[PDB]
Amino acid sequence: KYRVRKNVLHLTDTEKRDFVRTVLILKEKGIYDRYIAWHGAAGKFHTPPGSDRNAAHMSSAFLPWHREYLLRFERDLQSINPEVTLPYWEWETDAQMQDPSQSQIWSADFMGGNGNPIKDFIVDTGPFAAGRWTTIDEQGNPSGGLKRNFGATKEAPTLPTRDDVLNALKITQYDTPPWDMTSQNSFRNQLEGFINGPQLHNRVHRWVGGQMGVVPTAPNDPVFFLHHANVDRIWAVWQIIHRNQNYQPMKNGPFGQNFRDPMYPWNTTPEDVMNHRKLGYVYDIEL
Amino acid sequence: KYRVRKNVLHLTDTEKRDFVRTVLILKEKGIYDRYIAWHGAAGKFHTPPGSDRNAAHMSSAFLPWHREYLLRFERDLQSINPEVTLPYWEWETDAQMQDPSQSQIWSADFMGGNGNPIKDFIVDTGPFAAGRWTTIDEQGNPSGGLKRNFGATKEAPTLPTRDDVLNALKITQYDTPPWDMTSQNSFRNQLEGFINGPQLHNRVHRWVGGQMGVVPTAPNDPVFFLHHANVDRIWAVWQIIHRNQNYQPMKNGPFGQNFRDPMYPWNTTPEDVMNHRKLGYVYDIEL
Numbered sequence: 001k002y003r004v005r006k007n008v009l010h011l012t013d014t015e016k017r018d019f020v021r022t023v024l025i026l027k028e029k030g031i032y033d034r035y036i037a038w039h040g041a042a043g044k045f046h047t048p049p050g051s052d053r054n055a056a057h058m059s060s061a062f063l064p065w066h067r068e069y070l071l072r073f074e075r076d077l078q079s080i081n082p083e084v085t086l087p088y089w090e091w092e093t094d095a096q097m098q099d100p101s102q103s104q105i106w107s108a109d110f111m112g113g114n115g116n117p118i119k120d121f122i123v124d125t126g127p128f129a130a131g132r133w134t135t136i137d138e139q140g141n142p143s144g145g146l147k148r149n150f151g152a153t154k155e156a157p158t159l160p161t162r163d164d165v166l167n168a169l170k171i172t173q174y175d176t177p178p179w180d181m182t183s184q185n186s187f188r189n190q191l192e193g194f195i196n197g198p199q200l201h202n203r204v205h206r207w208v209g210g211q212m213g214v215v216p217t218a219p220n221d222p223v224f225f226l227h228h229a230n231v232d233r234i235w236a237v238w239q240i241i242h243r244n245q246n247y248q249p250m251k252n253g254p255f256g257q258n259f260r261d262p263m264y265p266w267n268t269t270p271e272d273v274m275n276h277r278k279l280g281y282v283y284d285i286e287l
Numbered sequence: 288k289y290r291v292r293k294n295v296l297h298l299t300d301t302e303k304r305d306f307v308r309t310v311l312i313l314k315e316k317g318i319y320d321r322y323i324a325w326h327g328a329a330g331k332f333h334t335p336p337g338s339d340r341n342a343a344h345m346s347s348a349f350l351p352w353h354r355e356y357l358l359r360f361e362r363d364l365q366s367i368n369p370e371v372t373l374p375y376w377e378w379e380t381d382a383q384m385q386d387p388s389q390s391q392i393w394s395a396d397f398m399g400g401n402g403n404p405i406k407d408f409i410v411d412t413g414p415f416a417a418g419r420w421t422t423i424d425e426q427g428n429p430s431g432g433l434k435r436n437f438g439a440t441k442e443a444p445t446l447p448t449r450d451d452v453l454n455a456l457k458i459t460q461y462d463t464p465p466w467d468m469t470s471q472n473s474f475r476n477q478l479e480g481f482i483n484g485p486q487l488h489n490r491v492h493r494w495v496g497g498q499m500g501v502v503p504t505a506p507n508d509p510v511f512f513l514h515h516a517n518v519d520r521i522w523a524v525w526q527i528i529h530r531n532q533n534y535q536p537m538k539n540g541p542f543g544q545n546f547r548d549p550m551y552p553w554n555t556t557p558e559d560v561m562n563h564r565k566l567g568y569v570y571d572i573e574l
């Protein structure tokens with residue numbers, strides 16, 4: 001209830017500055033890489049082995065996994081600067097623009113801009129530009145700096161619309177068997193973006209491109225957390241709307257996907273994080 | 288103080304069966320794979336990125352990381368069978384044998400025997416033989432069964448001797464700069480096995496061969512925990528001997544390696560596990 005997560009575009013110049021500086025500190029201390037690694041490791045952890053489900057994606061645990069992910073991350077933010085909370089990128093609103101790359105989120109004082117085509121789409125503006133921000137690859141070894149390539153792919157030329165979000169919120173069931181990419185009438189799978197994909201969450205990843213378009217490397221871009229803060233907001237909206245609806249599956253799903261199964265790489269269960277207000281934060285739209 | 292960790296050779300037939308059965312249960316539930324993954328993930332987490340140090344190896348955190356690792360693992364054992372504790376493989380005494388492969392640890396009622404050359408060194412005896420125990424590879428996908436190849440490599444034809452262990456215990460300093468594989472006059476690096484390697488801990492891995500000889504895959508073999516229980520046994524002996532010595536580095540080491548740094552993939556610090564008795568277990572030789 002205490003911590004307010006604000007729309008990025010509604011942040012003050014000081015708020016934008018403080019967040020960035022805090023993220024940079026986390027990076028310098030070595031704390032930020034933990035999250036990159038955590039995300040990568042979970043992607044390789046299949047539930048069960050052989051299937052295309054993993055601890056963090058393509059299954060029911062997708063939403064609670066990332067909520068815990070962001071929760072831990074926001075806590076680390078506060079440990080540096082107690083006035084700093086995790087803001088969210090409301091991409092569905094930016095989709096209304098003729099050129100979403102002109103959105104203030106991509107300004108030099110915050111996330112920085114698109115990749116430079118002349119420099120192989122290396123980001124050379126903002127606080128996370130090359131020579132200011134080092135990235136790591138799939139193996140955990142140093143890369144060559146952050147990359148972005150907005151709407152370059154055929155599959156995801158645009159950002160998800162407000163309509164896309166509203167249609168997702170209409171879904172009655174949190175998730176359906178067989179709790180994977182093939183799940184239908186599943187809010188989880190729809191929001192994740194596999195219903196006629198890439199949509200919503202998956203579409204944003206592919207739209208940004210660079211490290212964000214690739215699962216093991218995605219958190220190398222700070223906008224990852226901004227993205228998923230919005231995803232976690234949409235989920236929280238859905239929960240309030242459908243309060244008679246609960247997490248699925250409760251039982252008999254793959255291990256790691258059930259209501260009280262531990263979510264690798266943590267002992268945290270989906271139940272632990274089903275109530276976001278209990279976790280000590282709220283989105284500004286709730287006020 | 289409560290949970291007693293016994294020498295494998297001093298286990299009863301009932302104790303051997305219970306341990307094995309519990310491990311199989313852990314495997315079936317999906318809990319065992321978590322530990323394989325945790326280990327693999329930590330190996331890929333370099334401190335700092337660029338160096339050959341990682342969260343679990345080739346650095347000061349090697350010993351406390353695995354102590355926490357075993358602690359969690361033993362807890363999961365207890366959650367299934369409160370009478371089962373983690374035993375240790377005293378390989379230095381098996382080294383005194385003309386043929387260490389004849390040791391009772393490798394009997395069909397416990398760990399099973401060496402790999403079958405006809406079957407590409409797949410283990411076909413004991414409860415963890417092919418078709419009874421499934422393994423996963425570096426990527427997290429099914430492999431095709433446990434492998435072992437005792438003393439096949441030129442570098443590690445034999446197991447470490449009791450003398451090797453005694454010589455390690457004589458080292459006064461826990462670890463030395465630059466806190467890596469090149470650390471000289473370092474108990475940590477000596478016990479780990481990079482001093483004229485492969486020695487001690489590293490040598491045992493290479494001697495067993497199969498998955499055990501490879502970092503990403505090593506915990507696929509249940510003897511991994513028995514091995515490290517002995518490694519974890521030797522350290523406390525060193526601790527008891529050099530009571531005026533403490534963990535190093537306390538400060539100014541790489542992040543993740545200092546006394547009060549979180550050890551990826553956990554929040555656990557080396558300090559948290561410096562006193563093994565405080566953790567609620569003791570080795571039989573201490574009584």
Ligand SMILES: Oc1ccc(O)cc1
Nearest residue numbers: 202205213214215218
């Ligand atoms: O972390 C990621 C999740 C989904 C994607 O489609 C790409 C990256």
Ligand SMILES: Oc1ccc(O)cc1
Nearest residue numbers: 488489492501502505
């Ligand atoms: O996982 C492993 C760690 C260290 C070794 O020396 C061998 C395997």
Ligand SMILES: [Zn+2]
Nearest residue numbers: 007009010093
């Ligand atoms: Zn506005």
Ligand SMILES: [Zn+2]
Nearest residue numbers: 201205218228
């Ligand atoms: Zn994502």
Ligand SMILES: [Zn+2]
Nearest residue numbers: 056057215218
């Ligand atoms: Zn992801």
Ligand SMILES: [Zn+2]
Nearest residue numbers: 326344502505
């Ligand atoms: Zn290892």
Ligand SMILES: [Zn+2]
Nearest residue numbers: 488492505515
């Ligand atoms: Zn080892």
